[PDB]
PDB file of N, CA, C and O in Angstrom:
ATOM      1  N   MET A   1       0.827  -1.201   0.000  1.00  0.00           N
ATOM      2  CA  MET A   1       0.000   0.000   0.000  1.00  0.00           C
ATOM      3  C   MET A   1       0.865   1.257   0.000  1.00  0.00           C
ATOM      4  O   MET A   1       0.488   2.281  -0.568  1.00  0.00           O
ATOM      5  N   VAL A   2       2.027   1.169   0.641  1.00  0.00           N
ATOM      6  CA  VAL A   2       2.946   2.299   0.714  1.00  0.00           C
ATOM      7  C   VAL A   2       4.303   1.943   0.119  1.00  0.00           C
ATOM      8  O   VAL A   2       5.238   1.597   0.841  1.00  0.00           O
ATOM      9  N   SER A   3       4.404   2.028  -1.204  1.00  0.00           N
ATOM     10  CA  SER A   3       5.647   1.712  -1.898  1.00  0.00           C
ATOM     11  C   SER A   3       6.361   2.985  -2.342  1.00  0.00           C
ATOM     12  O   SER A   3       5.730   4.018  -2.561  1.00  0.00           O
ATOM     13  N   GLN A   4       7.681   2.901  -2.472  1.00  0.00           N
ATOM     14  CA  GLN A   4       8.482   4.046  -2.889  1.00  0.00           C
ATOM     15  C   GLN A   4       9.880   3.608  -3.310  1.00  0.00           C
ATOM     16  O   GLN A   4      10.223   2.428  -3.231  1.00  0.00           O
ATOM     17  N   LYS A   5      10.684   4.565  -3.760  1.00  0.00           N
ATOM     18  CA  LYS A   5      12.047   4.279  -4.194  1.00  0.00           C
ATOM     19  C   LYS A   5      12.952   5.488  -3.976  1.00  0.00           C
ATOM     20  O   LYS A   5      12.488   6.561  -3.595  1.00  0.00           O
ATOM     21  N   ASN A   6      14.245   5.305  -4.223  1.00  0.00           N
ATOM     22  CA  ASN A   6      15.214   6.381  -4.056  1.00  0.00           C
ATOM     23  C   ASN A   6      16.275   6.335  -5.152  1.00  0.00           C
ATOM     24  O   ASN A   6      17.104   5.428  -5.190  1.00  0.00           O
ATOM     25  N   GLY A   7      16.240   7.321  -6.043  1.00  0.00           N
ATOM     26  CA  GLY A   7      17.202   7.375  -7.129  1.00  0.00           C
ATOM     27  C   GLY A   7      17.531   8.795  -7.542  1.00  0.00           C
ATOM     28  O   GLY A   7      17.245   9.744  -6.811  1.00  0.00           O
ATOM     29  N   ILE A   8      18.135   8.943  -8.716  1.00  0.00           N
ATOM     30  CA  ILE A   8      18.504  10.258  -9.225  1.00  0.00           C
ATOM     31  C   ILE A   8      17.662  10.634 -10.440  1.00  0.00           C
ATOM     32  O   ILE A   8      18.118  11.358 -11.324  1.00  0.00           O
ATOM     33  N   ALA A   9      16.429  10.138 -10.475  1.00  0.00           N
ATOM     34  CA  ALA A   9      15.522  10.425 -11.579  1.00  0.00           C
ATOM     35  C   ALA A   9      14.128   9.869 -11.302  1.00  0.00           C
ATOM     36  O   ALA A   9      13.124  10.548 -11.515  1.00  0.00           O
ATOM     37  N   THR A  10      14.075   8.628 -10.826  1.00  0.00           N
ATOM     38  CA  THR A  10      12.805   7.981 -10.522  1.00  0.00           C
ATOM     39  C   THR A  10      12.007   8.787  -9.503  1.00  0.00           C
ATOM     40  O   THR A  10      10.775   8.760  -9.502  1.00  0.00           O
ATOM     41  N   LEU A  11      12.715   9.503  -8.636  1.00  0.00           N
ATOM     42  CA  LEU A  11      12.073  10.317  -7.611  1.00  0.00           C
ATOM     43  C   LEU A  11      11.202  11.398  -8.242  1.00  0.00           C
ATOM     44  O   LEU A  11      10.167  11.778  -7.690  1.00  0.00           O
ATOM     45  N   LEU A  12      11.625  11.890  -9.401  1.00  0.00           N
ATOM     46  CA  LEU A  12      10.883  12.927 -10.109  1.00  0.00           C
ATOM     47  C   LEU A  12       9.441  12.493 -10.355  1.00  0.00           C
ATOM     48  O   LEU A  12       8.532  13.322 -10.397  1.00  0.00           O
ATOM     49  N   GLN A  13       9.239  11.189 -10.515  1.00  0.00           N
ATOM     50  CA  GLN A  13       7.908  10.646 -10.755  1.00  0.00           C
ATOM     51  C   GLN A  13       7.026  10.803  -9.520  1.00  0.00           C
ATOM     52  O   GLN A  13       5.867  11.204  -9.621  1.00  0.00           O
ATOM     53  N   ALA A  14       7.583  10.485  -8.356  1.00  0.00           N
ATOM     54  CA  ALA A  14       6.847  10.591  -7.102  1.00  0.00           C
ATOM     55  C   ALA A  14       6.563  12.049  -6.756  1.00  0.00           C
ATOM     56  O   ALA A  14       5.491  12.379  -6.251  1.00  0.00           O
ATOM     57  N   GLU A  15       7.533  12.917  -7.029  1.00  0.00           N
ATOM     58  CA  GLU A  15       7.386  14.339  -6.743  1.00  0.00           C
ATOM     59  C   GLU A  15       6.327  14.969  -7.644  1.00  0.00           C
ATOM     60  O   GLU A  15       5.476  15.729  -7.182  1.00  0.00           O
ATOM     61  N   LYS A  16       6.388  14.648  -8.931  1.00  0.00           N
ATOM     62  CA  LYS A  16       5.435  15.180  -9.899  1.00  0.00           C
ATOM     63  C   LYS A  16       4.022  14.689  -9.597  1.00  0.00           C
ATOM     64  O   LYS A  16       3.083  15.480  -9.528  1.00  0.00           O
ATOM     65  N   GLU A  17       3.881  13.379  -9.418  1.00  0.00           N
ATOM     66  CA  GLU A  17       2.584  12.784  -9.124  1.00  0.00           C
ATOM     67  C   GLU A  17       2.012  13.340  -7.822  1.00  0.00           C
ATOM     68  O   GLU A  17       0.826  13.653  -7.736  1.00  0.00           O
ATOM     69  N   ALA A  18       2.868  13.459  -6.812  1.00  0.00           N
ATOM     70  CA  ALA A  18       2.451  13.978  -5.516  1.00  0.00           C
ATOM     71  C   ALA A  18       1.938  15.410  -5.636  1.00  0.00           C
ATOM     72  O   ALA A  18       0.872  15.744  -5.117  1.00  0.00           O
ATOM     73  N   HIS A  19       2.704  16.251  -6.322  1.00  0.00           N
ATOM     74  CA  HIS A  19       2.326  17.648  -6.511  1.00  0.00           C
ATOM     75  C   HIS A  19       1.041  17.758  -7.326  1.00  0.00           C
ATOM     76  O   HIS A  19       0.221  18.643  -7.089  1.00  0.00           O
ATOM     77  N   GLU A  20       0.875  16.853  -8.285  1.00  0.00           N
ATOM     78  CA  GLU A  20      -0.310  16.851  -9.136  1.00  0.00           C
ATOM     79  C   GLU A  20      -1.562  16.534  -8.324  1.00  0.00           C
ATOM     80  O   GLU A  20      -2.577  17.222  -8.434  1.00  0.00           O
ATOM     81  N   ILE A  21      -1.481  15.488  -7.508  1.00  0.00           N
ATOM     82  CA  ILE A  21      -2.608  15.080  -6.677  1.00  0.00           C
ATOM     83  C   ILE A  21      -2.934  16.142  -5.633  1.00  0.00           C
ATOM     84  O   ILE A  21      -4.098  16.483  -5.422  1.00  0.00           O
ATOM     85  N   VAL A  22      -1.899  16.665  -4.984  1.00  0.00           N
ATOM     86  CA  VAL A  22      -2.074  17.692  -3.964  1.00  0.00           C
ATOM     87  C   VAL A  22      -2.628  18.978  -4.569  1.00  0.00           C
ATOM     88  O   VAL A  22      -3.470  19.645  -3.969  1.00  0.00           O
ATOM     89  N   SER A  23      -2.149  19.319  -5.761  1.00  0.00           N
ATOM     90  CA  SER A  23      -2.593  20.526  -6.446  1.00  0.00           C
ATOM     91  C   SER A  23      -4.043  20.390  -6.902  1.00  0.00           C
ATOM     92  O   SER A  23      -4.845  21.310  -6.743  1.00  0.00           O
ATOM     93  N   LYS A  24      -4.371  19.235  -7.471  1.00  0.00           N
ATOM     94  CA  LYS A  24      -5.723  18.976  -7.950  1.00  0.00           C
ATOM     95  C   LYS A  24      -6.717  18.962  -6.793  1.00  0.00           C
ATOM     96  O   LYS A  24      -7.795  19.550  -6.882  1.00  0.00           O
ATOM     97  N   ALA A  25      -6.347  18.288  -5.709  1.00  0.00           N
ATOM     98  CA  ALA A  25      -7.206  18.200  -4.534  1.00  0.00           C
ATOM     99  C   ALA A  25      -7.504  19.585  -3.969  1.00  0.00           C
ATOM    100  O   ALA A  25      -8.637  19.879  -3.586  1.00  0.00           O
ATOM    101  N   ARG A  26      -6.480  20.432  -3.919  1.00  0.00           N
ATOM    102  CA  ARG A  26      -6.634  21.785  -3.398  1.00  0.00           C
ATOM    103  C   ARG A  26      -7.520  22.623  -4.314  1.00  0.00           C
ATOM    104  O   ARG A  26      -8.418  23.328  -3.852  1.00  0.00           O
ATOM    105  N   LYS A  27      -7.261  22.543  -5.615  1.00  0.00           N
ATOM    106  CA  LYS A  27      -8.036  23.292  -6.596  1.00  0.00           C
ATOM    107  C   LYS A  27      -9.507  22.893  -6.550  1.00  0.00           C
ATOM    108  O   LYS A  27     -10.394  23.744  -6.625  1.00  0.00           O
ATOM    109  N   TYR A  28      -9.760  21.595  -6.424  1.00  0.00           N
ATOM    110  CA  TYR A  28     -11.124  21.084  -6.367  1.00  0.00           C
ATOM    111  C   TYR A  28     -11.806  21.496  -5.067  1.00  0.00           C
ATOM    112  O   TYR A  28     -12.970  21.898  -5.064  1.00  0.00           O
ATOM    113  N   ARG A  29     -11.074  21.392  -3.963  1.00  0.00           N
ATOM    114  CA  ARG A  29     -11.607  21.753  -2.655  1.00  0.00           C
ATOM    115  C   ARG A  29     -11.958  23.238  -2.602  1.00  0.00           C
ATOM    116  O   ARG A  29     -13.045  23.613  -2.162  1.00  0.00           O
ATOM    117  N   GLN A  30     -11.030  24.076  -3.052  1.00  0.00           N
ATOM    118  CA  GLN A  30     -11.240  25.518  -3.055  1.00  0.00           C
ATOM    119  C   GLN A  30     -12.347  25.905  -4.030  1.00  0.00           C
ATOM    120  O   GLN A  30     -13.202  26.735  -3.716  1.00  0.00           O
ATOM    121  N   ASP A  31     -12.326  25.301  -5.212  1.00  0.00           N
ATOM    122  CA  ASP A  31     -13.328  25.581  -6.233  1.00  0.00           C
ATOM    123  C   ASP A  31     -14.717  25.168  -5.759  1.00  0.00           C
ATOM    124  O   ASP A  31     -15.700  25.870  -5.996  1.00  0.00           O
ATOM    125  N   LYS A  32     -14.792  24.023  -5.088  1.00  0.00           N
ATOM    126  CA  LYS A  32     -16.060  23.515  -4.580  1.00  0.00           C
ATOM    127  C   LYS A  32     -16.573  24.381  -3.433  1.00  0.00           C
ATOM    128  O   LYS A  32     -17.754  24.727  -3.382  1.00  0.00           O
ATOM    129  N   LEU A  33     -15.677  24.728  -2.515  1.00  0.00           N
ATOM    130  CA  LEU A  33     -16.038  25.554  -1.368  1.00  0.00           C
ATOM    131  C   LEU A  33     -16.483  26.943  -1.817  1.00  0.00           C
ATOM    132  O   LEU A  33     -17.467  27.485  -1.311  1.00  0.00           O
ATOM    133  N   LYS A  34     -15.755  27.512  -2.770  1.00  0.00           N
ATOM    134  CA  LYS A  34     -16.075  28.836  -3.291  1.00  0.00           C
ATOM    135  C   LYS A  34     -17.410  28.823  -4.026  1.00  0.00           C
ATOM    136  O   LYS A  34     -18.283  29.650  -3.762  1.00  0.00           O
ATOM    137  N   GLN A  35     -17.562  27.879  -4.950  1.00  0.00           N
ATOM    138  CA  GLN A  35     -18.794  27.760  -5.723  1.00  0.00           C
ATOM    139  C   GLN A  35     -19.988  27.506  -4.809  1.00  0.00           C
ATOM    140  O   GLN A  35     -21.050  28.104  -4.978  1.00  0.00           O
ATOM    141  N   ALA A  36     -19.806  26.613  -3.841  1.00  0.00           N
ATOM    142  CA  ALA A  36     -20.869  26.281  -2.900  1.00  0.00           C
ATOM    143  C   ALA A  36     -21.255  27.493  -2.058  1.00  0.00           C
ATOM    144  O   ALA A  36     -22.437  27.784  -1.876  1.00  0.00           O
ATOM    145  N   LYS A  37     -20.250  28.196  -1.546  1.00  0.00           N
ATOM    146  CA  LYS A  37     -20.484  29.377  -0.724  1.00  0.00           C
ATOM    147  C   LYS A  37     -21.420  30.354  -1.429  1.00  0.00           C
ATOM    148  O   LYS A  37     -22.353  30.883  -0.823  1.00  0.00           O
ATOM    149  N   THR A  38     -21.168  30.588  -2.712  1.00  0.00           N
ATOM    150  CA  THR A  38     -21.988  31.501  -3.499  1.00  0.00           C
ATOM    151  C   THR A  38     -23.435  31.025  -3.559  1.00  0.00           C
ATOM    152  O   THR A  38     -24.365  31.817  -3.401  1.00  0.00           O
ATOM    153  N   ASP A  39     -23.619  29.730  -3.788  1.00  0.00           N
ATOM    154  CA  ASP A  39     -24.954  29.149  -3.867  1.00  0.00           C
ATOM    155  C   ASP A  39     -25.715  29.356  -2.561  1.00  0.00           C
ATOM    156  O   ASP A  39     -26.888  29.726  -2.567  1.00  0.00           O
ATOM    157  N   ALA A  40     -25.039  29.113  -1.443  1.00  0.00           N
ATOM    158  CA  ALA A  40     -25.650  29.274  -0.130  1.00  0.00           C
ATOM    159  C   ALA A  40     -26.051  30.726   0.115  1.00  0.00           C
ATOM    160  O   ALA A  40     -27.160  31.004   0.570  1.00  0.00           O
ATOM    161  N   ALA A  41     -25.141  31.645  -0.190  1.00  0.00           N
ATOM    162  CA  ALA A  41     -25.402  33.067  -0.004  1.00  0.00           C
ATOM    163  C   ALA A  41     -26.612  33.515  -0.816  1.00  0.00           C
ATOM    164  O   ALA A  41     -27.470  34.246  -0.320  1.00  0.00           O
ATOM    165  N   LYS A  42     -26.678  33.071  -2.067  1.00  0.00           N
ATOM    166  CA  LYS A  42     -27.784  33.424  -2.947  1.00  0.00           C
ATOM    167  C   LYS A  42     -29.086  32.791  -2.468  1.00  0.00           C
ATOM    168  O   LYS A  42     -30.155  33.389  -2.579  1.00  0.00           O
ATOM    169  N   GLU A  43     -28.987  31.579  -1.931  1.00  0.00           N
ATOM    170  CA  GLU A  43     -30.157  30.867  -1.433  1.00  0.00           C
ATOM    171  C   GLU A  43     -30.777  31.600  -0.247  1.00  0.00           C
ATOM    172  O   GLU A  43     -31.993  31.779  -0.181  1.00  0.00           O
ATOM    173  N   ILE A  44     -29.932  32.022   0.687  1.00  0.00           N
ATOM    174  CA  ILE A  44     -30.395  32.736   1.870  1.00  0.00           C
ATOM    175  C   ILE A  44     -30.900  34.129   1.508  1.00  0.00           C
ATOM    176  O   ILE A  44     -31.938  34.572   2.000  1.00  0.00           O
ATOM    177  N   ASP A  45     -30.159  34.815   0.645  1.00  0.00           N
ATOM    178  CA  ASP A  45     -30.533  36.157   0.213  1.00  0.00           C
ATOM    179  C   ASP A  45     -31.838  36.130  -0.576  1.00  0.00           C
ATOM    180  O   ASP A  45     -32.736  36.937  -0.336  1.00  0.00           O
ATOM    181  N   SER A  46     -31.934  35.200  -1.520  1.00  0.00           N
ATOM    182  CA  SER A  46     -33.127  35.071  -2.348  1.00  0.00           C
ATOM    183  C   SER A  46     -34.333  34.667  -1.505  1.00  0.00           C
ATOM    184  O   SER A  46     -35.425  35.216  -1.661  1.00  0.00           O
ATOM    185  N   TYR A  47     -34.127  33.706  -0.614  1.00  0.00           N
ATOM    186  CA  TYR A  47     -35.197  33.225   0.253  1.00  0.00           C
ATOM    187  C   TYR A  47     -35.633  34.310   1.233  1.00  0.00           C
ATOM    188  O   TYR A  47     -36.811  34.417   1.576  1.00  0.00           O
ATOM    189  N   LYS A  48     -34.675  35.114   1.680  1.00  0.00           N
ATOM    190  CA  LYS A  48     -34.957  36.193   2.619  1.00  0.00           C
ATOM    191  C   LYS A  48     -35.769  37.297   1.951  1.00  0.00           C
ATOM    192  O   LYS A  48     -36.732  37.807   2.526  1.00  0.00           O
ATOM    193  N   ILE A  49     -35.377  37.661   0.736  1.00  0.00           N
ATOM    194  CA  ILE A  49     -36.070  38.703  -0.011  1.00  0.00           C
ATOM    195  C   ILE A  49     -37.446  38.229  -0.467  1.00  0.00           C
ATOM    196  O   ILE A  49     -38.416  38.986  -0.437  1.00  0.00           O
ATOM    197  N   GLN A  50     -37.523  36.970  -0.888  1.00  0.00           N
ATOM    198  CA  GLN A  50     -38.781  36.395  -1.348  1.00  0.00           C
ATOM    199  C   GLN A  50     -39.764  36.237  -0.193  1.00  0.00           C
ATOM    200  O   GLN A  50     -40.952  36.528  -0.330  1.00  0.00           O
ATOM    201  N   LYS A  51     -39.260  35.774   0.946  1.00  0.00           N
ATOM    202  CA  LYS A  51     -40.092  35.577   2.127  1.00  0.00           C
ATOM    203  C   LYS A  51     -40.560  36.914   2.691  1.00  0.00           C
ATOM    204  O   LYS A  51     -41.729  37.076   3.040  1.00  0.00           O
ATOM    205  N   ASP A  52     -39.641  37.869   2.778  1.00  0.00           N
ATOM    206  CA  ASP A  52     -39.960  39.193   3.298  1.00  0.00           C
ATOM    207  C   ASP A  52     -40.947  39.913   2.383  1.00  0.00           C
ATOM    208  O   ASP A  52     -41.894  40.547   2.849  1.00  0.00           O
ATOM    209  N   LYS A  53     -40.717  39.812   1.079  1.00  0.00           N
ATOM    210  CA  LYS A  53     -41.584  40.452   0.097  1.00  0.00           C
ATOM    211  C   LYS A  53     -42.974  39.825   0.107  1.00  0.00           C
ATOM    212  O   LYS A  53     -43.982  40.527   0.039  1.00  0.00           O
ATOM    213  N   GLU A  54     -43.020  38.499   0.194  1.00  0.00           N
ATOM    214  CA  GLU A  54     -44.287  37.778   0.215  1.00  0.00           C
ATOM    215  C   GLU A  54     -45.076  38.100   1.481  1.00  0.00           C
ATOM    216  O   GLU A  54     -46.295  38.277   1.439  1.00  0.00           O
ATOM    217  N   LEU A  55     -44.373  38.175   2.606  1.00  0.00           N
ATOM    218  CA  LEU A  55     -45.007  38.474   3.885  1.00  0.00           C
ATOM    219  C   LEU A  55     -45.466  39.929   3.938  1.00  0.00           C
ATOM    220  O   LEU A  55     -46.533  40.235   4.470  1.00  0.00           O
ATOM    221  N   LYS A  56     -44.654  40.820   3.380  1.00  0.00           N
ATOM    222  CA  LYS A  56     -44.977  42.242   3.360  1.00  0.00           C
ATOM    223  C   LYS A  56     -46.266  42.496   2.585  1.00  0.00           C
ATOM    224  O   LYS A  56     -47.069  43.348   2.963  1.00  0.00           O
ATOM    225  N   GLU A  57     -46.456  41.750   1.501  1.00  0.00           N
ATOM    226  CA  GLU A  57     -47.649  41.895   0.675  1.00  0.00           C
ATOM    227  C   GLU A  57     -47.720  43.291   0.061  1.00  0.00           C
ATOM    228  O   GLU A  57     -46.916  44.165   0.387  1.00  0.00           O
ATOM    229  N   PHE A  58     -48.686  43.491  -0.828  1.00  0.00           N
ATOM    230  CA  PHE A  58     -48.861  44.779  -1.490  1.00  0.00           C
ATOM    231  C   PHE A  58     -50.042  45.541  -0.894  1.00  0.00           C
ATOM    232  O   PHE A  58     -49.990  46.759  -0.732  1.00  0.00           O
ATOM    233  N   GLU A  59     -51.106  44.811  -0.571  1.00  0.00           N
ATOM    234  CA  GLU A  59     -52.301  45.418   0.006  1.00  0.00           C
ATOM    235  C   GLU A  59     -51.986  46.071   1.348  1.00  0.00           C
ATOM    236  O   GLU A  59     -52.588  47.081   1.715  1.00  0.00           O
ATOM    237  N   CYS A  60     -51.039  45.488   2.075  1.00  0.00           N
ATOM    238  CA  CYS A  60     -50.643  46.013   3.378  1.00  0.00           C
ATOM    239  C   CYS A  60     -49.144  46.287   3.421  1.00  0.00           C
ATOM    240  O   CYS A  60     -48.716  47.436   3.528  1.00  0.00           O
TER     241      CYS A  60
END
């Protein structure tokens, strides 16, 4: 499950792959958190304005 090696070139493979996975995971996590945050904010804002407007009514 945990294999590795030590050389003067083969290591580049582990370093590249590691950086790729770590970079992708971070980009996805940040992108997901950022995108999600916006959705939540809009949901609360939209629901708040819609609920307040509906409750306020026009007749009163």
